[PDB]
Design a protein around this ligand. Structure first.
Ligand SMILES: [Ca+2]
Length: 671
């Protein structure tokens, strides 16, 4: 609703907090499209009309609708939405930029993991395939033909979320089942070439499940099946670098989950924290699917934070072997989130053939006799598939395992080659399939879900975009942002003791020119000022199946005092109003130099002044707002001929329009 007169506005109850908008960072997001997380699908139609956009994807499984903007930027769409006063919308965000953590080619190395490594004599690498001698990674993780006799991934479907897979490769015959190309809602028939984005996905597929048939190589889980999900498509068809967008990736993840995938392999990422992607990953894990994600690609590219950074995933580091010891590959991003490391250097696997869609070259010296093409790659993207393969084998033996149990089993059985037990480079060590398969499956060490719920003082409204950091001296740290209901969810994380830090709404909507100057907030963030941020710390908090939730109650103080003499005005009153002018929270006689204490109010408000009779001349009204102890000057101008005005640190600023107003607001949580 809108308003024209302040004195005529009715009294209303707290309206909660502002709509949750995804942070906008130059060069970090795709232009012309918005992803809308909703509760009430009908409310999305109010956004479609406001931006006159077109719905291009509906994902009811996670209540998301993607809207194409048709000649408007994301920022402009936010401007059309920010003052609409929607109630059943969870968030509005762009699709963020993501890149594949690209593997690089390396030359074969006959000495790799040899000489006093781990049994390099008398059929050391006897897997039955002609190229077995070169599969040092299988030897490193403890694979043996005898082990496959017990478990090999039978009936387990593995989703390779990547560039697509050349299912026509001879070493993948019978191994690639029906998949999905979300960009075009196109089903990919079993055994077909879907390598639209290049060679990576095929290399991944071979490491995981190349066929055990005496020829070429063999995967970690030769009994498993590969379900290709194309998220890096042909850039000539989808533009950019081929990334299909956070919305289409979510569609692909949902499709894979709905169609039976029990583990997915991911080696891509970007800086943007996406609520949509969080929802998709959590959807898959809630359905019991394990999500393996490669650790970052390097330092220069401080991106690829997500999806690797979402709590619950199994993050994998790349391991090399030289000088008789395992070691982090180097290009592997160091992070406390790394669970385990796996072979990721000189990994021989399947690549698309010369006339296949995703051909990117091959090593012609590989002595294969099946007419197939192979190449040696290095990278964290070469390590993750080893772990995905190990998970597939484990899921055959422990069909009832929950994702946290699979991750803890891997960490509990990893080979600590460094001797320190755990570190930010390789987590708990080298993944070991043989030790992991022995089990048993852990019954303790993790929780299906831990939540941190942040609300205002009385616990009436959840506070959105509050950062929640779970830190500890050793082990993985976790991070998540609260959603519209104030909840930050942590699925399948470790049980144990953490130091948990919570930080007030995120004030990313700066009001100063990046080039060092003065500006104005767009009104996109929940809070407009650093002074509104609240913090809480809970040291030694114990997370376990008996303590799965932490409730945090924010509080604040707010006082306002005006210094201007308004004796020339008729019955001047100080008014606390809704920023959208939907109504008022209270009116009181104006008193110069009188301090009004609003510390008990919670939510988002604006300040105004009204008079019974119109002002004869312009009058500037000035005051001081003391917010959480910080003094902030405020002012506004009551124009001649008018009976009301707004007062704030920007002079009484409407961030919206006359028709759809949204005045600068003050974010508080009560007491
Ligand atoms: Ca083979």
């Amino acid at each position: 609703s809108k308003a024209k007169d302040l004195a005529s506005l009715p009294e209303i109850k707290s309206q909660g907090y502002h709509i949750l908008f995804g942070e906008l960072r130059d060069g970090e997001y795709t232009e012309g499209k918005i992803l809308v997380g909703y509760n009430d699908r009908s409310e999305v139609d109010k956004i479609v009309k406001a931006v006159n956009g077109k719905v291009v994807l509906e994902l009811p499984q996670i209540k998301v609708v993607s809207i194409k903007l048709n000649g408007m930027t994301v920022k402009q769409a936010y401007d059309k939405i920010k003052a609409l006063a929607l109630k059943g919308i969870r968030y509005v965000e762009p699709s963020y930029k993501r890149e594949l953590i690209k593997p690089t080619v390396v030359k074969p190395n006959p000495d790799m993991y040899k000489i006093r490594k781990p049994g390099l004599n008398s059929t050391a690498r006897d897997y039955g395939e002609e190229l077995s001698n070169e599969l040092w990674g299988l030897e490193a993780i403890g694979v043996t033909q005898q082990l496959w006799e017990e478990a090999s991934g039978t009936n387990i479907i593995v989703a390779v979320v990547d560039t697509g897979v050349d299912g026509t490769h001879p070493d993948l015959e019978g191994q690639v089942i029906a998949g999905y190309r979300p960009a075009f809602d196109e089903e990919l028939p079993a055994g077909t070439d879907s390598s639209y984005g290049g060679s990576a996905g095929t290399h991944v597929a071979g490491t995981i499940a190349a066929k055990k048939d005496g020829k070429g190589i063999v995967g970690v889980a030769p009994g498993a099946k590969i379900m290709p999900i194309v998220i890096f498509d042909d850039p000539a068809l989808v533009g950019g670098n081929g990334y299909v967008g956070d919305d289409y990736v979510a569609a692909g993840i949902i499709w894979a989950t709905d169609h039976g995938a029990k583990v997915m392999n991911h080696s891509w990422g970007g800086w943007g924290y996406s609520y949509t992607m969080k929802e998709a990953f959590d959807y898959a894990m809630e359905h019991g699917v394990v999500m393996v994600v490669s650790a970052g690609n390097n330092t220069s590219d401080s991106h690829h934070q997500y999806p690797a950074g979402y709590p619950g995933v199994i993050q994998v580091a790349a391991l090399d072997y030289y000088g008789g010891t395992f070691r982090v590959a180097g290009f592997s991003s160091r992070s406390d989130g790394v669970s385990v490391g796996a072979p990721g250097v000189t990994i021989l696997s399947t690549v698309p053939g010369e006339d296949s869609i995703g051909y990117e070259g091959h090593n012609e010296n590989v002595p294969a006799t099946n007419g197939g093409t192979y190449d040696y790659y290095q990278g964290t993207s070469m390590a993750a598939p080893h772990v995905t393969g190990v998970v597939a084998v484990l899921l055959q033996k422990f069909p009832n395992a929950k994702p946290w149990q699979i991750r803890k089993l891997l960490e509990n059985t990893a080979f600590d080659f460094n001797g320190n037990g755990w570190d930010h480079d390789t987590g708990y060590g080298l993944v070991k399939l043989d030790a992991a398969l022995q089990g048993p499956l852990p019954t303790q060490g993790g929780v299906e879900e831990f939540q941190v719920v942040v609300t205002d003082a009385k616990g009436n409204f959840g506070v959105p975009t509050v950062f929640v950091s779970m830190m500890r001296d050793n082990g993985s740290c976790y991070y998540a942002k609260t959603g519209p209901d104030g909840i930050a969810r942590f699925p399948h994380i470790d049980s144990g003791t953490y130091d948990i830090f919570v930080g007030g709404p995120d004030h990313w909507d700066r009001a100063l020119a990046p080039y060092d100057g003065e500006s104005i907030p767009g009104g996109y963030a929940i809070a407009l000022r650093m002074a509104e941020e609240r913090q809480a710390s809970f040291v030694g908090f114990g997370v376990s199946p008996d303590a799965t939730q932490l409730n945090v109650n924010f509080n604040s103080t707010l006082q306002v005092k005006f210094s201007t003499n308004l004796s020339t005005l008729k019955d001047p009153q100080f008014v606390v109003v809704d920023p959208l002018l939907r109504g008022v929270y209270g009116r009181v006689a104006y008193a110069r130099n009188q301090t009004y204490d609003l510390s008990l109010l919670s939510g988002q408000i604006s300040f105004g002044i009204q008079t019974l009779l119109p002002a004869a001349t312009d009058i500037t009204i000035q005051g001081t707002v003391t917010l959480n102890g910080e003094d902030i000057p405020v002012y506004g101008v009551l124009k001649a001929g008018t009976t009301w005005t707004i007062i704030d640190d920007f002079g009484g600023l409407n961030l919206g329009t006359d028709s759809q107003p949204i005045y600068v607001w003050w974010t508080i949580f009560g007491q």
